[PDB]
Design a protein around this nucleic acid. Structure first.
Ligand SMILES: [Mg+2]
Ligand SMILES: [Mg+2]
Ligand SMILES: [Mg+2]
Ligand SMILES: [Mg+2]
Ligand SMILES: [Mg+2]
Ligand SMILES: [Mg+2]
Ligand SMILES: [Mg+2]
Ligand SMILES: [Mg+2]
Ligand SMILES: [Mg+2]
Ligand SMILES: [Mg+2]
Ligand SMILES: [Mg+2]
Ligand SMILES: [Mg+2]
Ligand SMILES: [Mg+2]
Ligand SMILES: [Mg+2]
Ligand SMILES: [Mg+2]
Ligand SMILES: [Mg+2]
Ligand SMILES: [Mg+2]
Ligand SMILES: [Mg+2]
Ligand SMILES: [Mg+2]
Ligand SMILES: [Mg+2]
Ligand SMILES: [Mg+2]
Ligand SMILES: [Mg+2]
Ligand SMILES: [Mg+2]
Ligand SMILES: [Mg+2]
Ligand SMILES: [Mg+2]
Ligand SMILES: [Mg+2]
Ligand SMILES: [Mg+2]
Ligand SMILES: [Mg+2]
Ligand SMILES: [Mg+2]
Ligand SMILES: [Mg+2]
Ligand SMILES: [Mg+2]
Ligand SMILES: [Mg+2]
Ligand SMILES: [Mg+2]
Ligand SMILES: [Mg+2]
Ligand SMILES: [Mg+2]
Ligand SMILES: [Mg+2]
Ligand SMILES: [Mg+2]
Ligand SMILES: [Mg+2]
Lengths: 67, 51, 103, 89
RNA sequence: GAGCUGUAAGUAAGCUUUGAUCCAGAGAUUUCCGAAUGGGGAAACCCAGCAUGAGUUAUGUCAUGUUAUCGAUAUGUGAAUACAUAGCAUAUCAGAAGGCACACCCGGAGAACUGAAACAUCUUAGUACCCGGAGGAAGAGAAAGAAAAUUCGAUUCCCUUAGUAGCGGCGAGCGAAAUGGGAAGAGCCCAAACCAACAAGCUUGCUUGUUGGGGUUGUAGGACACUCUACGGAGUUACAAAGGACGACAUUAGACGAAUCAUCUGGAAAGAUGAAUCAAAGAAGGUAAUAAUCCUGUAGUCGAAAAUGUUGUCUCUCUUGAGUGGAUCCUGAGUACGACGGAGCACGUGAAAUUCCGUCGGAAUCUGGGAGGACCAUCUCCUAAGGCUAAAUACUCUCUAGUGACCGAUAGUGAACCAGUACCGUGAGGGAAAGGUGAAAAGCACCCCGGAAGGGGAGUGAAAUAGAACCUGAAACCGUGUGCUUACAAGUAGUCAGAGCCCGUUAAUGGGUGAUGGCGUGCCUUUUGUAGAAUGAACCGGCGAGUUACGAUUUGAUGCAAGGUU
């Protein structure tokens, strides 16, 4: 997913993080309350937050390097 | 007599055959072989250094 | 190095000289499974979605080295080489030209 | 934060009887205090909390496969919301 | 380049030719503890301060930073005291700490058992163990040398010299060096004279000071005084140092890569047999048994985004070299030496030179000074009291690539197995045992007995007394059957002699049993002497003890011999 996460704004990146973190909370919450049965959604949302935080760290690397 | 690089490669893979310089003769590959095949330039060379 | 859809021939085994299409390949222990060849007979107890069942005659795995690709000209079994054609890497038949197997 | 510090709900027969009252049981993070459990449950669920009760459990010794080891230590919160409810299925 | 979601099965969810999983290069993240450094503390936890920030009506809470100690640099301020310093104050720097294979190396400290057949000098031994240092090596290193020739020309290491010289209750025992043969193989810089400024005392001159130049050596150098000479050289390993450019290979992922069929036996062939083929590949490992030609490979060849790694050439940076005269000046002071007390030198304080330490003494200036194993004298050699220096050398926790008349599971690391782990100890510390189904899990569907375990079928498989304690399964031991024997007999359990009753062999003047007769007090170790009531062994199985290196001497053998040998 690292081709459209670069296309975001660094102000839509920080919103897509907390959008995905609400999603990761909901299907971690109904994993315990046992009606889920599609558990591969948990890992693919944990990696999506890792994509969204790697590009929103190397913005600040480049923003500090050329400054 | 001297190191022939193409004889030492063309005989390297046959089981039983061994290539040797005239300077490099030792007792354990002479007595291992059933037959020598020396050249002209190696027969004169082993004749000079062994006698 | 045979791929998932190939028509092959077996050299060693109960069945030798036998044709058949590979259906899975198991790479990290290199044991392919060829249809018709190495038919095991399991003893399965009844499952959650299955009956009891007597023997379950399914295919076992064959080692890769016991299995060889055929020639598209001669139908002899043949070894496989590699050619570079427009950057890709295709499979020479080592006795004739190209073997073609997408599926 | 605020959803890192709630991990799971706790659904037992000691917990469902507390849901006859307004009490809800959560397995929260082990590094948190009961003030920010209260400030997190009313951020996620938009309720109003009267009280909250914490307790630590120690690691419980388990042997699976005949090799010995321990379960995780866990921190359990019992929130006691005034009005509203937490919708569960 | 087609599968994948660790070991690790599974299911369930999925993901992937739009190239996943994996493989390298680079990067991001990197909880808490720990030198742990905001404070504390029983490490992996508490309690903060400050400054921002979120939240809240406000607190409470939370987030992010920042706050140990000396150290360095700054400016504040300046006590007893008047200046001044102490000291406090902030503000920068992050310098130190801790860790290790710390194996090797260099220092500081430094035993004992033992050997001398006791033992004190001596030896063990500057060993072990502590400390402190460091580095990829360290240390040493450019003659106040070794020597005594028509001498050599930094150090280190190797061979010899040589168990020689010598030391030593001249006991035990220690134990060189030079020459010669090799590896490797470069020398430098400073203090001082003097000169230049500069700055202050001071009196304008001198002194001191910094800085710069200068110049560093015995064939006596250098200041000085002369004459004659310049950017060619030199290079980050010493010799002063930064950092480019462009290449070169080097690793850190890889990619090609020759050539076989048939029949027989088998569950399976790579074996046998028959006919081929490749080889710059007949290394090796797999594949249902023993494969150059089935597979992975090998020989050979090719490859790099990116990372470093060396290494070239430019760039760049530094830089005059000689000669003569030596009149004068300089050439390393509480130093060298001396005494006393020690240590080190192979050398035990001695005929002790030479090298250090403590304590006091205490020099010389080129017509100088030191050394040549006491001391003089004479010759000869060298120039102390400043410093730096690669290589040859040591070591392997490791990494990469390999090797073995090395181990095969009581061996080999303690550990082939979710080992310094169960376990033991309050603690340091001590520390195991435990590999093998099959080719493939095809891991026994069903039936019967049973509560279940277990079995008996059936079934898989070449084999199931290969059934998961699973390759073979030896003895001790436990059994069940039996053929011959045995209830008047005194026994080291046999041994010859033998009737009877069974049996039939690696077929030979056979095998099993034994009515009865004759003879006969186990085995080791220890002893003058053991049935010994002397020791040791419950039994069985495994393990379990004259080896190796170096030297010496003897024979044996073989070279060739007045020579033999490296
Ligand atoms: Mg890629
Ligand atoms: Mg702290
Ligand atoms: Mg700090
Ligand atoms: Mg703080
Ligand atoms: Mg240290
Ligand atoms: Mg002693
Ligand atoms: Mg003694
Ligand atoms: Mg000694
Ligand atoms: Mg000492
Ligand atoms: Mg290093
Ligand atoms: Mg050095
Ligand atoms: Mg030195
Ligand atoms: Mg001289
Ligand atoms: Mg065949
Ligand atoms: Mg054959
Ligand atoms: Mg076999
Ligand atoms: Mg190769
Ligand atoms: Mg001097
Ligand atoms: Mg002297
Ligand atoms: Mg001399
Ligand atoms: Mg065994
Ligand atoms: Mg062992
Ligand atoms: Mg049963
Ligand atoms: Mg058997
Ligand atoms: Mg076997
Ligand atoms: Mg067995
Ligand atoms: Mg009787
Ligand atoms: Mg005995
Ligand atoms: Mg006696
Ligand atoms: Mg005797
Ligand atoms: Mg006895
Ligand atoms: Mg006794
Ligand atoms: Mg006994
Ligand atoms: Mg025994
Ligand atoms: Mg002996
Ligand atoms: Mg001899
Ligand atoms: Mg002899
Ligand atoms: Mg002789």
């Amino acid at each position: 997913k690292a081709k459209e996460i670069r296309d975001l704004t660094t102000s839509e990146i920080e919103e897509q993080i907390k959008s995905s973190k609400e999603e990761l909370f909901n299907l971690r919450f109904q994993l315990a309350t046992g009606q889920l049965e599609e558990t591969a959604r948990i890992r693919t949302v944990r990696k999506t937050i890792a994509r969204l935080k790697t590009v929103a760290r190397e913005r600040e690397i480049e923003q500090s390097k050329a400054n | 007599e001297n190191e022939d690089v193409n004889v030492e490669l063309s005989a390297r893979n046959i089981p039983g055959v061994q290539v040797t310089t005239a300077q490099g003769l030792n007792v354990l590959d002479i007595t291992n072989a059933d037959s020598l095949v020396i050249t002209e330039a190696a027969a004169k060379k082993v004749e000079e250094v062994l006698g | 190095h045979i791929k998932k859809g190939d028509n092959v021939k077996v050299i060693a085994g109960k069945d030798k000289g036998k044709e058949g299409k590979v259906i899975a390949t198991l790479p990290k222990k290199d044991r392919v499974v060829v249809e018709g060849v190495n038919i095991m007979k399991k003893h399965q107890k009844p499952t959650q979605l299955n009956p009891e069942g007597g023997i379950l005659e399914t295919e076992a795995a064959i080692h890769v080295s016991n299995v060889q690709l055929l020639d598209p000209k001669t139908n002899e079994p043949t070894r496989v080489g590699y050619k570079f054609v427009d950057g890709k890497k295709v499979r020479i038949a080592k006795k004739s030209g190209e073997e073609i197997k997408s599926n | 934060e605020a959803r890192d510090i709630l991990k799971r709900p706790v659904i037992t027969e000691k917990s469902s009887e507390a849901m006859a009252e307004d009490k809800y049981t959560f397995d929260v993070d082990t590094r948190v205090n009961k003030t920010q459990v209260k400030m997190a449950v009313e951020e996620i669920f938009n309720v109003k909390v009267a009280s909250v009760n914490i307790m630590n459990y120690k690691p419980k010794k388990k042997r699976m496969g005949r090799y010995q080891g321990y379960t995780n230590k866990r921190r359990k919160a019992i929130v006691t919301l005034k009005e509203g409810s937490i919708d569960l299925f």
